[PDB]
Ligand binder design. Structure first.
Ligand SMILES: CCCS(=O)(=O)Nc1ccc(F)c(-c2cc3cnc(NCCCO)nc3n(C)c2=O)c1F
Length: 267
C-alpha cells in the first residue's frame, strides 16, 4: 500500500537539476523516472515524519496534468521519485530555445496549466511557485505541473528567480500567510503573459529590487499591449483579470477554465 521504495531498487543517472533544496536526477525504476533527492545530509527524526507528511500531500494527487508521484525513498538519502518527462519545460521552450508555438497550441497549454491548477485547488493544494519553469511539456503536447509539494519542509527547515510570478501581496511580505488560491491565479497570469508575449515581464528593468519594490506598491505591472497581434481580445482581458493587483478581484480557476475553454471554441 505505502509508497516507500527500498534501498538498491532505484538507479540514479545523469544529473539535471541544481541548487539547495534537493538535487534532481534522471533515474530508472520500472522504466525511466526522475528522482529528487533532498541533500539534507542525514536527518533527525521529527524531520523524517515531516518528510512523510509531505508525501501524504503528494499522493493526494492523481491527474493527467499534475506530475505523477510514483513513490518516495528515505534510505540512501531522502528523495521523491516521479515519472520522467521526455521533452523540455515551458520556460525552456519559451525563453531559451525560442520555440515558436502556434496560437492554438499556446491556448491549449494555458488551458492544461489551468486545468491542472484547478485540480490542485479542488484538492486544497496551493502551488505557491507556479511558473513556466515548473510546467513540463511532456512529449510536447501534455502539460505536467510539478514542484508544488513539500512547502512545509522549507518554512521549518534550514524566492528569487521566482519573483516575476509573485503576486504583489506576496512580494511585500505583509503577514503570516500571503499565499492563496488567488496568488496562484496571478502566477498563472504571468505564464499567460509568457505564452502570449513569448517574453518574461519587465525585460527592460535591470535593477531587480525596483521590480520587487514597484510590483509591491502597484507602481509596476505587466505591459499587456505586447500580446502578439493575433492573441484574442478575450485573452488580453482574461490576462488582466488574473493579474489584478488587489487579490480579491482575481477569478478562481473553475472560472478561468471556463473563459479559456470558451475562447478556444471560437477561433
Ligand atoms: C507530485 C509533486 C512532487 S514535487 O516534489 O512537488 N515535484 C517534483 C518532485 C520530484 C521530481 F523529480 C520532480 C521533477 C520531475 C521532472 C520530470 N521530467 C523533467 N524533465 C526535464 C525538465 C526540463 O526542465 N524534469 C523534472 N524535474 C526538473 C523535476 O524537478 C518534481 F517536479
Amino acid at each position: 500500500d505505502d509508497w516507500e521504495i527500498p534501498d538498491g531498487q532505484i538507479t540514479v543517472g545523469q544529473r539535471i537539476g541544481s541548487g539547495s533544496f534537493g538535487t534532481v536526477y534522471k533515474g530508472k525504476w520500472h522504466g525511466d523516472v526522475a528522482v529528487k533527492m533532498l541533500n539534507v545530509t542525514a536527518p533527525t527524526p521529527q524531520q523524517l515524519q515531516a518528510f512523510k507528511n509531505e508525501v501524504g500531500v503528494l499522493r493526494k494527487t492523481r491527474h493527467v496534468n499534475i506530475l505523477l508521484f510514483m513513490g518516495y525513498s528515505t534510505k540512501p538519502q531522502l528523495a521523491i521519485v516521479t515519472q520522467w518527462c521526455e521533452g523540455s519545460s515551458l520556460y525552456h521552450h519559451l525563453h531559451i530555445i525560442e520555440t515558436k508555438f502556434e496560437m492554438i497550441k499556446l491556448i491549449d497549454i494555458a488551458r492544461q496549466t489551468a486545468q491542472g491548477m484547478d485540480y490542485l485547488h479542488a484538492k486544497s493544494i496551493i502551488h505557491r511557485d507556479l511558473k513556466s519553469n515548473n510546467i513540463f511539456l511532456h512529449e510536447d503536447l501534455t502539460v505536467k505541473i510539478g514542484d508544488f509539494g513539500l512547502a512545509t519542509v522549507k518554512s521549518r527547515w534550514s524566492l528569487s528567480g521566482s519573483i516575476l510570478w509573485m503576486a504583489p501581496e506576496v512580494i511585500r511580505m505583509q503577514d503570516k500567510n500571503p499565499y492563496s488560491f488567488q496568488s496562484d491565479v496571478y502566477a498563472f497570469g504571468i505564464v499567460l503573459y509568457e505564452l502570449m508575449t513569448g517574453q518574461l515581464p519587465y525585460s527592460n528593468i535591470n535593477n531587480r529590487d525596483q521590480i520587487i519594490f514597484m510590483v509591491g506598491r502597484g507602481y509596476l505591472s505587466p505591459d499587456l499591449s505586447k500580446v502578439r497581434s493575433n492573441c484574442p481580445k478575450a485573452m488580453k482581458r482574461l490576462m488582466a483579470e488574473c493579474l489584478k493587483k488587489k487579490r480579491d478581484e482575481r477569478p478562481l480557476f473553475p472560472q478561468i477554465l471556463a473563459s479559456i475553454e470558451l475562447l478556444a471554441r471560437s477561433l
